[PDB]
Structure 1
Amino acid sequence: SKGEELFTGVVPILVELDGDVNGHKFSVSGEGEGDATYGKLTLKFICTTGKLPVPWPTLVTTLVQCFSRYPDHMKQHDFFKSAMPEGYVQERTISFKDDGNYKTRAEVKFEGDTLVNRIELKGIDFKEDGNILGHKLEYNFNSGNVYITADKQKNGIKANFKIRHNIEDGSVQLADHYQQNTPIGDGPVLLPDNHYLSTQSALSKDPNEKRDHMVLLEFVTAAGI
């Protein structure tokens, strides 16, 4: 597609999130770059409002699947880049087992030559000392797959996947993800066959950073065709 041409090099990324979880208001700003040729993302996120009131790993999936590496033989299945530069809306319900849920709405689009992800996040029905508001999740993030299917009536895609957040005691907090994406623009997009994205993510800290923050390195590769 026309859009995939925008991703042949390194692309600067901006992420901006506004959040309310159980009435705890917070904002996150991220900066970095994506190189879809290698499925590679490098980003640093900062909580600009103070302490983040939820664990950082629980925001990883919310905080740009257009940077996935689609192998040449599957390029006709890359919805995400096909919607660019006008972009797409990405909506999710993330259901934390035995706890609350996030509902998210994001717009992913180019602003000049920069890929922007703008997100509103609302979290409700969280337990005051559950694994999320009680900060009982380890600072890491497991490898996993994101299963994509076409949504022809919405000219878009859906995804379903199960994130497993490691709890500090050796157990797991499941976060069921249901996702829908729809184009913003009126140009044609690629509606894919069933496939998945395979992810790997490394979380770290900037030793010189005193603000609450997350350094993220992620690799994502499309597969399943």
Structure 2
Amino acid sequence: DPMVSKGEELFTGVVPILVELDGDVNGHKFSVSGEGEGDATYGKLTLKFICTTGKLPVPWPTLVTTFLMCFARYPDHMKQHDFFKSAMPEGYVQERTIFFKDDGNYKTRAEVKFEGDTLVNRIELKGIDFKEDGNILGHKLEYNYNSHNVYIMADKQKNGIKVNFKIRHNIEDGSVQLADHYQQNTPIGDGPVLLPDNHYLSYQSALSKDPNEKRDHMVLLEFVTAAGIT
């Protein structure tokens, strides 16, 4: 299928990635840069993020979902359902509202596209209605991350997809902070795209620190695999 080819020929080996985020949460301004690489053959992402404006005013875990679904591993039998690659290289817009239970919300707009050989994710994030001293602005979330299925459905009237899912962030006292994700993606270009059957992406995420890094930062290792169409 020459449409599948086109995505194949783009994601076949290791692809360098760049991520840029401008954020404002309750007027706490910050910028983040990230660099790394993805290998969609294995559903594998390796990234390192740096707060270039000093201290990050929110917990690193709360930004993981914001900081590359085109790197998912789609099994051979599911290749007709891979919206994200099909949009490349012109790319897609990924927009979310993230509702933190009993706290504020993030609203994010990203453009994910190639710039030459490099796969770029440029994001603007606005946070509003956060509690000063809540779990987010009060830095009460553990530096870890749970595995999670993400359910994708076609958004046929918009030539894109809708994605809906819950993330539970471990709080230091042993409880959990719900972050309810609402997501829409739409191609940037005017060309055709693969609109998928309902399926899900399986995520695992591991957060660590670079021992030689003095700046505020996050090392993220992610594996992502499409499933749910046998």
TM-score range, shorter-chain basis?
A: over 0.9
What's the CA shift for 1:3?
Answer: 2.4
Partners of 1:17 and 1:3 in 2: CA distance: 26
Partners of 1:158 and 1:11 in 2: CA distance: 26
Equivalent pair of 1:83/1:189 in contact (CA under 8 Å): yes
1:220 equivalent to 2:224? Answer yes
What's the CA shift for 1:5?
Answer: 2.1
What's the CA shift for 1:179?
Answer: 0.3
Equivalent pair of 1:149/1:194 in contact (CA under 8 Å): yes
Cα deviation, 1:67-105, whole Å, max 9, x if unaligned, reads 000000000000000000000000000000000000000
What's the CA shift for 1:187?
Answer: 1.0
Equivalent residue pairs, number: 225
Partners of 2:107 and 2:9 in 1: CA distance: 32
What's the CA shift for 1:2?
Answer: 1.7
What's the CA shift for 1:171?
Answer: 0.4
1:202 equivalent to 2:206? Answer yes
Between the aligned residues of both structures, percent identity stands at 96
**In the alignment, what sits opposite 1:38?**
42
Partners of 2:6 and 2:80 in 1: CA distance: 12
Cα deviation, 1:164-213, whole Å, max 9, x if unaligned, reads 00001110000000000000001110000000000001000000000000
What's the CA shift for 1:149?
Answer: 0.2
Give the alignment's TM-score, normalised by structure 1.
0.99
Cα deviation, 1:133-191, whole Å, max 9, x if unaligned, reads 00000001110011100001110001000000000111000000000000000111000
**In the alignment, what sits opposite 2:56?**
52
Any idea what SS the aligned residue of 1:2 has?
Answer: helix
User: In structure 1, which of residues 103, 106, 122 is the aligned counterpart of residue 107 of structure 2?
Assistant: 103
What's the CA shift for 1:4?
Answer: 3.2
1:8 equivalent to 2:12? Answer yes
Root-mean-square deviation over aligned CA pairs: 0.6
Partners of 1:113 and 1:154 in 2: CA distance: 28
What runs of 5+ residues in structure 1 fail to find an aligned partner?
none
Equivalent pair of 1:4/1:82 in contact (CA under 8 Å): no
Equivalent pair of 1:162/1:175 in contact (CA under 8 Å): yes
Equivalent pair of 1:14/1:115 in contact (CA under 8 Å): yes
Partners of 1:77 and 1:39 in 2: CA distance: 15
1:124 equivalent to 2:111? Answer no
Equivalent pair of 1:199/1:220 in contact (CA under 8 Å): yes
Partners of 1:123 and 1:56 in 2: CA distance: 14
